[PDB]
C-alpha cells in the first residue's frame, strides 16, 4: 500500500525550458540485493492510454526520446526533461512496483504558456429540426486562443459549457456553448448576443443576430 | 505491433456484473504476464488485477471477490470478470502486457473500454445540426444521451483539422456533446459535410446532414 506523491500540483512551462518532476514515495522501492529502484514514469496524452516512458526510475523505455531522463532513488525520484516541446503537453504519472498494490502518484499537469491568442468566436440560432422536437440552443465557439482564462456572456437561468483541454499542436484552447432554452420561450425575446472578454480583450469581442423569425 | 483491444465494457446497474475481453495481437502471447488498471472519472490511475506468466492472480483489496482476473493463451485474450459494480467502479478499463518476459509492468496498453455504473437507462442520443465573407463555420450538437460514451465524426471521418470535439457535459443522467467544424466559405454548401455519430449499445449509428436553414414560415 505504498503511496506515491507528486508536486505540485499544476505548472506553467514554454518550448525550450527545462522541466523537474517530483515523486515521493512512502517507502523505498530500492531493494539492497540487487540494488534496483522499482519505479516507473508516464506519459497519457489526454484522451489516449498512456505510455511507459521511465522504469527502474532511470531507464529509458525504447524510443522514449533523449530530452528525457530518469534520475533519483529510494524514495525521492526525478524525471529529466532537457527541451520541453509541445509534443509533451500532457500529465505525467509515477509508479511504484516493489509489492501490491502497484500504486500511482496524483499525476501533474503542465499547462502550456506561449502567447496570448485571439479567440475567433461562431454564433448558432437551435436548428430548424430542434424547435421541431421541443427544446432550443444556441452554440457560440471560441476557437484558438491562449489563456485558458476568459469567462463569456441577459438572463441566464440555465446554460452548459465545455473546454478543450490544450492543443498539442498550436498551444491553445477552445469552448462551447449550450445555451439551452424552451422552444417558445425563445419567441419572448428577439435580440440574442453572445459576448467574450479576453486577457489582451479590454474592447470585449461579440457575434450577435435577431431571431430569423422577426 | 503489440495491440491490445479491448472490448464489451459500458453500463451496468449497481451489483451487476460485466465481462471485459482484451485481445491481443502480435507477440508470443504465453511469455509475457498481464495485468489490467482503471482510470477514475477524476482522471486518477487506480491498479486493478495482475496475472503472471503462470496464472497467479493478483488483486487490488477494493475489488478482491467481486472481480476476477482470467487468460486464455490458446486465443491471445484476456478476461477481466466483474461482479457486484460499485459506483466507485465507474471509470476506463484498459488491459496492460508485461513490458518483458518478467514481472507486470505496464509494458503496453490498450485503448481503453470505459464501464458506467449508474441505475440509469439506456438512451439514444439525438442530434441537431447546426448551419449559420473569409471562413464559415458549422457544428453539430448530441442533446441527451446515455450512458457515455459516443462518436462524432465528419464527413464519415474524412474532416481532419478545424474540428474542435468538446468534453460530454451530463445534466440530469443525459449527455451533451457539441462539435465546431471550419472550411473556407467557397467549400459550403459546395460540398456536402455530414455529423455522423455512434452510440453502441444502443446500437443506434446516426448521420445528420448539415443542410441550410431556409426561409419557410407560411
Known amino acids: 500500500d505504498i503511496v506515491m506523491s507528486q508536486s505540485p500540483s499544476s505548472l506553467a512551462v514554454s518550448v525550450g525550458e527545462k522541466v523537474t518532476m517530483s515523486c515521493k514515495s512512502s517507502?523505498?522501492?530500492?531493494?539492497?540485493?540487487?540494488?534496483?529502484?522499482?519505479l516507473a514514469w508516464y506519459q497519457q496524452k489526454p484522451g489516449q492510454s498512456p505510455k511507459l516512458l521511465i522504469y527502474w526510475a532511470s531507464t529509458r523505455e525504447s524510443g522514449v526520446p533523449d530530452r528525457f531522463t530518469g534520475s533519483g532513488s529510494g524514495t525521492e525520484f526525478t524525471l529529466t526533461i532537457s527541451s520541453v516541446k509541445a509534443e509533451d503537453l500532457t500529465v505525467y504519472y509515477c509508479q511504484q512496483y516493489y509489492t501490491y498494490p502497484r500504486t500511482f502518484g496524483g499525476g501533474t499537469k503542465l499547462e502550456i504558456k506561449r502567447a496570448d491568442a485571439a479567440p475567433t468566436v461562431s454564433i448558432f440560432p437551435p436548428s430548424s429540426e430542434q424547435l421541431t422536437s421541443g427544446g432550443a440552443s444556441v452554440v457560440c465557439f471560441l476557437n484558438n486562443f491562449y489563456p485558458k482564462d476568459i469567462n463569456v456572456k441577459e438572463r441566464q437561468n440555465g446554460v452548459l459549457n465545455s473546454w478543450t483541454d490544450q492543443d498539442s499542436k498550436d498551444s491553445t484552447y477552445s469552448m462551447s456553448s449550450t445555451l439551452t432554452l424552451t422552444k417558445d420561450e425563445y419567441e419572448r425575446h428577439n435580440s440574442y448576443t453572445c459576448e467574450a472578454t479576453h486577457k489582451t480583450s479590454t474592447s470585449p469581442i461579440v457575434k450577435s443576430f435577431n431571431r430569423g423569425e422577426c | 505491433e503489440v495491440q491490445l483491444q479491448e472490448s464489451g465494457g459500458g453500463l451496468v446497474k449497481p451489483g451487476g456484473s460485466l465481462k471485459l475481453s482484451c485481445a491481443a495481437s502480435g507477440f508470443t502471447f504465453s511469455t509475457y504476464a498481464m495485468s489490467w488498471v482503471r482510470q477514475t472519472p477524476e482522471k486518477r490511475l487506480e491498479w486493478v488485477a495482475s496475472i503472471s506468466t503462470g496464472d497467479n492472480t493478483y488483486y487490488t483489496d477494493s475489488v478482491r471477490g467481486r472481480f476476477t482476473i482470467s487468460r486464455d493463451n490458446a486465443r491471445n485474450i484476456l478476461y477481466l470478470q466483474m461482479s457486484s459494480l460499485r459506483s466507485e467502479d465507474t471509470a476506463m478499463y484498459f488491459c496492460?502486457?508485461?513490458?518483458?518476459?518478467?514481472?507486470?509492468?505496464?509494458?503496453?496498453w490498450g485503448q481503453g473500454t470505459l464501464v458506467t455504473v449508474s441505475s440509469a437507462k439506456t438512451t439514444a442520443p439525438s442530434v441537431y445540426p447546426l448551419a449559420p465573407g473569409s471562413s464559415v463555420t458549422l457544428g453539430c450538437l448530441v442533446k441527451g444521451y446515455f450512458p457515455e460514451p459516443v462518436t462524432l465524426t465528419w464527413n464519415s471521418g474524412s474532416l481532419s483539422s478545424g474540428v474542435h470535439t468538446f468534453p460530454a457535459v451530463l445534466q440530469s443522467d443525459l449527455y451533451t456533446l457539441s462539435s465546431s467544424v471550419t472550411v473556407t466559405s467557397s467549400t459550403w454548401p459546395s460540398q456536402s459535410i455530414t455529423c455522423n455519430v455512434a452510440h453502441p449499445a444502443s446500437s443506434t449509428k446516426v448521420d445528420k446532414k448539415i443542410e441550410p436553414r431556409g426561409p419557410t414560415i407560411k
Open positions: 496492460t502486457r508485461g513490458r518483458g518476459d518478467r514481472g507486470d509492468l505496464f509494458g503496453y
Open positions: 517507502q523505498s522501492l530500492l531493494y539492497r540485493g540487487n540494488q534496483m529502484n522499482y
